[PDB]
């Protein structure tokens, strides 16, 4: 096994899909592998677990018209604000034929702090609908840091419409 191998898999597991040596434990607890390499791989793969959880939700609560206009228009934002995360992850699929950057700890950091927020705004919104879901999305615009507070103030303009 080599450090060059592990960074191949680590490009697919940022996209929810499995890899040649990274796999899964049982399902949606964690991304357990198969040294110190392993530990930095694990710590990166916790961006995959945050992708599945936000992908599935927009794949189901769109294609369910019962979930209403808000609900759909939310799942549109969680698709747009995730297509731009595939834009990033395309350049990292290129740039093979070095790349490691502590096996990417400084590339992924800025969006993993945006893959959080949304995965918690999903679980805070779960079960609501209608203009009540335009309230859970207004619960999180009351926080200090203009990353989360501006990311969530965009969704509270899509979901306002």
């Amino acid at each position: 096994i080599t450090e060059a191998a592990l960074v191949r898999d680590i490009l697919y597991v940022f996209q929810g899909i499995d890899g040649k040596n990274i796999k899964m434990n049982n399902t949606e607890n964690c991304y357990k592998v198969e040294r110190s390499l392993r530990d930095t791989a694990v710590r990166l793969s916790e961006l995959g677990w945050l992708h599945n959880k936000i992908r599935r939700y927009t794949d189901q609560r769109s294609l369910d018209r019962s979930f209403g206009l808000v609900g759909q228009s939310f799942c549109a934002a969680l698709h747009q604000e995730l297509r731009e995360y595939y834009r990033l992850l395309s350049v990292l699929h290129s740039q093979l034929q070095s790349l490691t950057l502590r096996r990417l700890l400084v590339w992924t950091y800025d969006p993993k702090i945006r893959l959080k927020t949304l995965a918690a705004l999903v679980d805070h919104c779960q079960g609501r609908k209608g203009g009540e879901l335009a309230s859970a999305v207004h619960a999180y615009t009351k926080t200090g840091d203009p990353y989360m507070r501006s990311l969530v103030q965009h969704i509270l303009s899509l979901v306002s419409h």
Partner: protein, 229 residues
Amino acid sequence: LQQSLELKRKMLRDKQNKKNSGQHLPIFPAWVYERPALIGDFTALPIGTLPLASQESAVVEDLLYVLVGVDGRYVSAQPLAGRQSRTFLVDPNLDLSIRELVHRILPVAASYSAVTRFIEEKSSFEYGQVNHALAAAMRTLVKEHLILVSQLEQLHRQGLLSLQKLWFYIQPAMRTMDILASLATSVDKGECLGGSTLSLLHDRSFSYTGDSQAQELCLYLTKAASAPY
């Protein structure tokens, strides 16, 4: 370690009885606190026979792990991550002159853990807007520590970096993590939150009227954490 679950319990009830004039504060899902998420640290060769030059050359990559919170191969972080600061387990058969240099560097790693943990905790809604804004400006500077510990690996792969070079290069970083981890642990003991942390930052913005490098930190962190208030 565990008692933060209880502190958040006391806190959120208190934010409710302050907001008896209202309702429906946000809160994070439990997985945000249960998962290892953004926390720091968690068959190798006969290093006693590995000769002195290569013995340094093996140890210097572990520091490049341990400076971001990864258990190395030698020099690996301890359990009881609790209390307020880490300790580490550099081996009994590593050369004594190298061990006494390793113990001189680690106080930036011991102080990287215990800043990730203030970036995590003091971001959730139990803690007001000001502890968020502080714990986010502090989140920014921890990226630049990740840029830097990446540069040092690039020089290492070229065979071009060694422990007396490493101890030159980390020095402005080792300073900032002391300033941050102190200004973090001071907010836990002096547990009070917004309006009071906005004092604590400004008090140290006088205490460092000499040092200038650490004086721009405290004007940065205060001018950032000021904005919500």
